């Protein structure tokens, strides 16, 4: 613990509880972008994978990290969803 | 750009002021149509402050006075029947009794009333600053009809007073369109353009059959009152009133030159540039000689036969801007300070 004031550090997309519920398999990546917003990170190394990260580091009272990994095939169809709401 | 110097002329006779007195604060530095008028051997005058005074034409003594207040009386003093009609900057047309000055009726008109009232066929005609013209009943004061003359974004201060002839009122406009309307219900017979170019017009006049009009920096034109088509044009322009008699036109132009033109084709007879850029008032005819004032107060009398000056007289220090009036052997001019001068 430290007494020094650290500002609120936020990173990534703002994943709410309802958009993660309405996202589903088999649906196209452009309408995924319409539903969820533009993903701030995507895989640059040859795979159509979108990384929806909800990173919050408020003060000294812990770090919260929800990551949603969306895998798209060559045609942009979402083939798999991977939601991890904790570290 | 410089005002011309005062011309030295040998006065054939020596005019004098029969009597003079002040009605109030007067028009002052403002620009207004307000001028005195004569009927029944008495003169009625007013100031911009709100004081309205009546004076006998022979002695110049006060007979009654009332205050309309700053009521800002803009329209000229016009007398007809038992009432006097004066327009105001506050869009009011006041009707005062000719006997004691008490108000007979007061009704708000649709716009700022600058033009001098014109009385005809039981109605009084007022042209407002916003272009549209209204006719008010002489007894009730209610507006009978309103005609919506168009208006450009920029115009000259002072609206044209309509002239009635053969049951139709011919009026100018700030867009250069002389308009003729019927007195019955205000419907429009014809309108014709006669003209940055402001194209503002002044009051027209009819001698017989043909209308005469003169727009500011436009054309002096002759139009038929029935058909409304133009007959002849001269490229002269003016905002002051002009007078017609015999076969000659007397007017003061844009640059305040005094000149005479014929009815038949508008050919000039003479022109005097001695009063160039001196702010002259509208010309009037008295004792067979043309009379004009200036902004310095020097009256100039012109012989109509060839334009020579016949008499020059220093009258008032404040100067003259409004319309002089002349009738029944008396001519009266109200200075900018409101002192009405009667000349012999």
């Amino acid at each position: 613990e430290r007494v020094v004031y650290r500002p609120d550090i936020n990173q990534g997309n703002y994943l709410t509880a309802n958009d993660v519920s309405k996202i589903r398999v088999g649906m196209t990546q452009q309408q995924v972008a319409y539903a969820l917003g533009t993903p701030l990170m995507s895989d640059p190394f040859g795979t159509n994978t979108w990384f929806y990260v909800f990173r919050q580091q408020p003060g000294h009272e812990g770090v919260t990290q929800q990551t949603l990994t969306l895998t798209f095939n060559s045609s942009g169809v979402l083939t798999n969803i991977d939601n991890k709401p904790a570290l | 750009v410089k005002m011309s110097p005062l011309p030295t002329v040998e006065n054939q006779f020596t005019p004098t002021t029969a009597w003079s007195t002040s009605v109030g604060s007067g028009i002052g530095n403002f620009y207004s149509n307000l001028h005195p008028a004569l009927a029944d051997n008495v003169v009625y005058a007013a100031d911009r402050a709100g004081l309205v005074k009546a004076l006998n034409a022979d002695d110049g003594k006060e007979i009654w006075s009332v205050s309309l207040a700053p009521a800002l009386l803009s329209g000229g003093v016009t007398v007809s029947g038992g009432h006097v009609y004066i327009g105001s900057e506050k869009a009011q047309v006041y009707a005062l009794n000719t006997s004691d000055g008490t108000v007979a009726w007061q009704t708000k008109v649709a716009g700022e009333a600058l033009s001098r009232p014109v009385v005809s066929d039981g109605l009084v005609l007022i042209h407002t600053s916003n272009g549209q013209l209204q006719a008010l009943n002489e007894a009730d004061g209610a507006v009978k009809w309103t005609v919506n003359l168009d208006m450009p974004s920029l115009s000259l201060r002072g609206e044209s007073a309509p002239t009635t002839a053969f049951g139709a009122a011919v009026v100018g406009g700030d867009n250069g369109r002389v308009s003729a309307v019927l007195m019955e219900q205000g419907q429009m017979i014809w309108q014709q353009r006669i003209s940055r170019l402001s194209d503002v017009d002044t009051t027209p006049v009819v001698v017989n059959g043909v209308v005469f009009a003169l727009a500011y920096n436009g054309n002096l034109t002759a139009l038929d009152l029935r058909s409304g088509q133009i007959m002849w044009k001269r490229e002269l322009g003016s905002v002051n009133d002009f007078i017609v008699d015999g076969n000659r036109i007397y007017l003061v132009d844009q640059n305040d030159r005094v000149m005479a033109l014929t009815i038949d084709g508008g050919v000039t007879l003479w022109t005097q540039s001695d009063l160039l850029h001196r702010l002259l008032t509208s010309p009037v005819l008295y004792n067979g000689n043309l009379v004009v004032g200036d902004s310095e107060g020097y009256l100039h009398w012109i012989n109509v036969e060839d334009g020579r000056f016949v008499a020059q007289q220093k009258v008032d220090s404040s100067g003259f801007q409004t319309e002089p009036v002349a009738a029944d052997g008396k001519l009266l001019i109200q200075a900018k300070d409101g002192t009405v001068y009667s000349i012999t």
Partner: protein, 634 residues
């Protein structure tokens, strides 16, 4: 041409002159003073028309409309007549509000933020303020480009109006890149560490504004402004760009001379708060006379950690000889080390906690009453009849401090206040046992909405006392007078004056003046004007910052002119007026010195220059004035 008359027709609720009084176009200009001119122009007519519209709208006249306006001019083209036709309509009161549309879950805040007192009169300015405040609230949550409209529907039976407002927050915008422009010298990390908006995160309008205001408070830049243009082709992506331009902060000067009053002089001075654009605060003062050898190095790293923890260190050495050759006159050696650690506890508050060591070596002090009180406090009993004495102390001090900084701007603040408390206390084992507290405040209250007229209240407080029977040493005394304190007085002269015992003066030469030299026949102790300062201090000043009456726009931001009124006194709380009756009472704080005058601060290329001229209208005996003063830094 000029305005001959402004006329309003159809108005009945308000006087025509009262309506005109808000217009930039002036119907009349008074003769007894100059407040403008009647020069007509088209552009300001639209502004005055909009002002008239707003004036009718904020009094419940929702049905207000202007029928037409007629600009007209005299035939001689010198006068301009402007008239406006007015339909006032009835007066209405606001009967309620209704909110609809895609509120994006913020309905509980929107409805409360749009809540009204029932029966209140309609106000178009309040409607516009509500429209903008809804945008602010939605922008704080990342909805940087919302669609909001409000239309008034009017019931002509009930004489009331209803505001149906439609709100669509749109997409939540994310920032991908934050860019800095114009930082030619400042390191990018120096600007980037003042940020509160993080790259790769959802936007916060409050975060961007806080970053902008922290960059303003940093003081290294000027005209800091922001723009948040969208990334092309993306539903919700923005680039937030900070555009700044850099000033030459601080100054550096040196000087070498011969044969002056100080003899052969070599004086230098360094002060930069943004040293080489790295953010370090570096100060290198020093002089080398025949009488003084001085050097002071202070280096502070404000971001020793990424959280904003600062690590300052001050190293200094002072050696003063009152005479060159004989070395028997007054001598004062002073050297020490001072390292301090500061960290922020809040967005505007920071705390400092450091350790300070200082060594003072005194020899052949000239007898003075307060100084001798200090020596007897320390337990030493030297002889008062001669200038043969010596005293030497090593002091360890725990330096602490607290700073509150909510100023509008770093260099010439126009709003907010700054409070800076500094304190010291001696660690046990030190020779001196004392404590000191110093409080400095500066509050700026802007008089005008453009912040050109600002009133400034500066108060400077100081108090020190001994801790264990021993007294606070006189090298820690406060002084007043000069640019940094009450102006118009000679620098560091305000305060208690030394009282000299009749003593054998060292290296006495008959053709000079000495305060109680026994060679002069001084039977008793002397009243003098020699200032030694006091353990307590209270200085206050009120300044009225005004625009420079002759400057141009391009130079206005770097020149500050202000009228001021200074108040201050320095007094010695431990002085004994009973023992010394006829001599002045230096324990009395009621001798407040006052002055008023004009000051001119300038952000010159040679550094911040302050020129001042003050008249000490309240002045006491034994004190001298210096009306014109100037400072090389801040």
């Amino acid at each position: 041409a000029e305005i001959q008359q402004i006329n309003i027709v159809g108005n009945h609720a308000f006087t025509t002159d009262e309506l005109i009084s808000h217009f930039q176009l002036r119907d009349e200009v008074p003769w007894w003073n100059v407040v403008g001119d009647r020069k007509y122009q088209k552009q300001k007519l639209a502004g005055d028309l909009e002002t008239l519209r707003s004036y009718y709208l904020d009094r419940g006249y929702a049905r207000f409309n202007i029928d037409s306006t007629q600009v007209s001019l005299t035939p001689d083209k010198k006068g301009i007549y402007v008239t406006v036709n007015i339909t006032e309509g009835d007066q209405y009161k606001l009967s309620g509000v209704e909110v609809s549309g895609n509120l994006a879950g913020h309905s509980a805040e929107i409805e409360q933020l749009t809540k009204i007192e029932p029966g209140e009169l309609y106000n178009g300015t309040k409607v516009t303020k509500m429209e903008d405040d809804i945008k602010k609230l939605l922008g704080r949550y990342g909805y940087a480009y919302p669609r909001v409209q409000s239309m008034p529907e009017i019931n002509d039976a009930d004489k009331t109006v209803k505001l149906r407002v439609n709100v669509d927050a749109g997409n939540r915008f994310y920032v991908r890149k934050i860019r800095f422009e114009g930082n030619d010298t400042s390191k990018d990390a120096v600007l980037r560490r003042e940020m509160r908006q993080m790259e790769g995160a959802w936007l916060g309008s409050d975060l961007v504004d806080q970053g902008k205001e922290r960059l303003n408070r940093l003081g290294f830049f000027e005209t800091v402004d922001t723009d948040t243009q969208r990334v092309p082709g993306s539903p919700d992506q923005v680039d937030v760009v900070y555009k700044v331009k850099e000033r030459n902060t601080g100054s550096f000067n040196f000087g070498i001379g011969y044969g002056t009053e100080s003899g052969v002089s070599f004086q230098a001075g360094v002060q930069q708060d943004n040293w080489l654009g790295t953010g370090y605060a570096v100060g290198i003062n020093g002089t080398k006379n025949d009488y003084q050898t001085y050097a002071e190095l202070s280096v502070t790293n404000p971001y020793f950690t990424v959280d904003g923890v600062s690590l300052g260190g001050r190293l200094f050495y002072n050696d003063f000889q009152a005479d060159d050759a004989d070395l028997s006159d007054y001598t004062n050696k002073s050297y020490g080390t001072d390292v301090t650690l500061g960290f922020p506890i809040n967005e505007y508050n920071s705390l400092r906690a450091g350790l300070g060591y200082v060594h003072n070596s005194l020899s052949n002090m000239q007898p003075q009453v307060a100084m001798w009180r200090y020596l007897y406090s320390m337990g030493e009993h030297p002889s008062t009849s001669d200038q043969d004495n010596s005293f030497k102390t090593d002091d360890f001090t725990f330096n602490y401090g607290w700073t509150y900084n909510k100023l509008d701007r770093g260099y010439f603040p126009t709003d907010g206040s700054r409070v800076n408390l500094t304190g010291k206390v001696t660690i046990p084992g030190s020779d001196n046992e004392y404590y000191k507290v110093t409080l400095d405040t500066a509050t700026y209250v802007p008089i005008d909405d453009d912040h050109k007229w600002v009133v400034l209240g500066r108060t400077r407080w100081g108090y020190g006392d001994g801790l264990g029977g021993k007294e606070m040493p006189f090298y820690e005394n406060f002084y007043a007078g000069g640019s940094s304190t009450v102006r118009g007085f000679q620098s560091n002269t305000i305060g208690p004056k030394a009282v000299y015992f009749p003593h054998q003066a060292s290296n006495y030469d008959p053709d000079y003046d000495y305060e109680c030299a026994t060679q002069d026949g001084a039977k008793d102790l002397c009243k003098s004007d020699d200032a030694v300062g006091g353990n307590a201090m209270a200085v206050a000043s009120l300044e009225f910052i005004t625009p420079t009456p002759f400057i141009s726009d391009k130079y206005a931001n770097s020149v500050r002119t202000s009228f001021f009124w200074d108040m201050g006194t320095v007094w010695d709380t431990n002085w004994d007026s009973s023992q010394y009756s006829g001599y002045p009472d230096y324990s009395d704080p009621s001798n407040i010195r006052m002055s008023a005058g004009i000051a001119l601060q300038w952000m010159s290329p040679l550094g911040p220059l302050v020129f001042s001229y003050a008249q000490p209208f309240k002045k006491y005996d034994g004190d001298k004035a210096e009306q014109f003063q100037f400072n090389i830094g801040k």
